[PDB]
């Protein structure tokens, strides 16, 4: 066997050596006959004594709270409404598979007879407000136009009107020209790559999450069966799982999980097929009632713009017209990007009298991407992670006793888990509440996914682990604690979800060091 370093290759090899070794064969000789002699010991005694790892002691006193940014209150960036949404519902005793959504929607719309002449309430600051109101009127109208049509359409593609051409951004991008034909231009500078404008933590992101942990009167998930539990582990598995799937079944976050899937799935399909059509996509979720009957819900409508997606990053603009009872003038900073109309009055006859609340519509120009839609469809992994978090927590607490603490964990009907905070201090909840909370977190981690979050989670974890080592009495020490903070706070910009997850850390730290 032979393999030789050739002319051209040798001339390279010789330049790629430590300094003052002008030939490879020269260098190889030094290496071949190298016997070590306190080289490191010598170079260390030589090197600067400024270079070292000084151990900053971590004491109950050392860690300060995180530096939350100041500025305007953060706005709602979630694609659809969560705690504010309203549903027009029908009973579905047809056991139907994938029933045509357009008609489910109309049947839902027909259940309500409290519509008004739409009038703008909270207007979108930077938008042609009258365009939104017009769009809703066009939607309202075009759904009637169906009723007097020779045949019935399976899907309604909206008329490309002045308002819809504006709201979906029709021909609102600059035209791509070669550099030769526009090289000598006066203001041909690079795209604006500025910092995101820093926003302050509003009180609503907590209020939204509180309702995520709430139980509902409806069953929001239906999971299929598996084989008989035979193997020992399979009994424990199905015990853990069945308990968890009980507490989570009715949780509001589960409604959001379905809601997201039902929207994203339909949006991504229409995004592919109807590339040039302004398709009306109704916002629908289906669930089983307290009684057990099947129930179909309409939250509002989404008109998708032109959907020419080549890259996963490339954006599709749409318009989220969503029903709500929430008066927008209560927290108008939340609805920064939204134009809110007053589109009817609702009458509820309660046991304390006749309540007449008014029906709003949270119209908003929004966007999404193939990647963002694909990950909206795979939201059910929130349940898998949520269950994983419990299963891991049990696996651990069980390994110390060397006895599975599953039945003990769930059957122990006593509010023991620190989970919330009232003005009284830290409040304790039940494993059931823990499950729903740990789900909700996992859901909002999906709804409000952002590099800010990704980064914050990663760095804050470190400080969190340090803090625990203190509580374990493991004489903790840092090297550059400030550096760690600077890296954490660097991520705290304008994301309500991140800012809240930071607030939570501060909240924890307060009680952790006591």
């Amino acid at each position: 066997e032979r393999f030789e370093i050739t002319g051209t290759m040798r001339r390279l090899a010789d330049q790629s050596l430590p300094p003052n070794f002008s030939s490879l064969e020269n260098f190889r000789a030094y290496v071949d006959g190298f016997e070590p002699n306190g080289c490191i010991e010598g170079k260390l005694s030589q090197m600067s004594k400024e270079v070292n790892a000084r151990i900053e002691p971590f004491l109950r006193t050392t860690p300060r709270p995180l530096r939350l940014p100041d500025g305007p209150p953060c706005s709602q960036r979630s694609k659809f409404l969560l705690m504010d949404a309203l549903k027009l519902s029908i009973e579905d005793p047809s056991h139907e598979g994938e029933g045509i959504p357009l008609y489910d929607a109309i049947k839902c719309m027909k259940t309500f007879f409290g519509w008004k002449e739409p009038n703008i309430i909270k207007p979108h600051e930077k938008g042609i407000n009258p365009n939104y109101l017009l769009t809703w009127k066009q939607v309202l109208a075009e759904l009637q136009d169906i009723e007097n049509e020779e045949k019935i359409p399976r899907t309604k593609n909206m008329k490309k009107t002045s308002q819809l051409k504006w709201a979906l951004g029709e021909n609102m991008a600059p035209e791509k020209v070669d550099f030769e034909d526009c090289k000598d231009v006066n203001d041909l500078k690079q795209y604006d790559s500025d910092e995101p404008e820093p926003r302050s933590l509003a009180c609503w992101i907590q209020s939204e999450f509180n309702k995520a942990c709430e139980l509902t009167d409806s069953s929001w998930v239906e999971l299929d069966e598996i084989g008989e539990d035979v193997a020992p582990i399979e009994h424990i598995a199905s015990m853990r799982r069945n308990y968890f799937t009980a507490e989570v079944s009715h949780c509001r976050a589960t409604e959001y999980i379905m809601k997201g899937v039902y929207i994203n799935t339909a949006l991504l399909n229409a995004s592919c097929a109807a590339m040039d059509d302004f398709q009306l996509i109704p916002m629908i979720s289906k669930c089983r009632t307290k009684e057990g009957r099947r129930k179909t819900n309409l939250y509002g409508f989404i008109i998708k713009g032109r959907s020419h997606l080549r890259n996963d990053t490339d954006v599709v603009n749409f318009v989220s017209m969503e029903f709500s009872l929430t008066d927008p003038r209560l927290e108008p900073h939340k609805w920064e990007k939204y134009c809110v109309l007053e589109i009817g009055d609702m009458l509820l006859r309660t046991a304390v009298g006749q309540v007449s609340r008014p029906m709003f519509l949270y119209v908003r120009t929004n966007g999404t991407s193939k990647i963002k839609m694909k990950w909206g469809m795979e939201m059910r992994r929130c349940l898998l992670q949520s269950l994983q978090q419990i299963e891991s927590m049990i696996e651990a607490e069980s390994s110390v006793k060397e006895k599975d603490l599953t039945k003990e964990f769930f059957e122990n009907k006593s509010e023991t888990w620190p989970i919330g905070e009232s003005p009284k201090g830290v409040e304790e909840g039940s494993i059931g509440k823990v499950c729903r909370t740990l789900l909700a977190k996992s859901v909002f981690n999906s709804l409000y996914a952002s590099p800010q979050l990704e980064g914050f989670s990663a760095e804050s974890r470190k400080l969190l682990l340090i803090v625990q080592a203190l509580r374990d009495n493991l004489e903790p020490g840092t090297f550059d604690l400030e550096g760690l903070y600077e890296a954490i706070e660097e991520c705290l910009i304008n994301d309500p979800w991140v800012l809240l997850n930071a607030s939570w850390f501060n909240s924890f730290l307060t009680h952790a060091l006591r």
Binding site: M83, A85, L86, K87, S89, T111, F112, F113, G114, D217, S218, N297, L325, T326, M346, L347, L348, R349, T350, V355, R357
Partner: peptide, 11 residues
């Protein structure tokens, strides 16, 4: 009454 999913017609 549930502000998310309230009953607006009688049966």
């Amino acid at each position: 009454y549930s502000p998310t999913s309230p009953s607006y017609s009688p049966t």
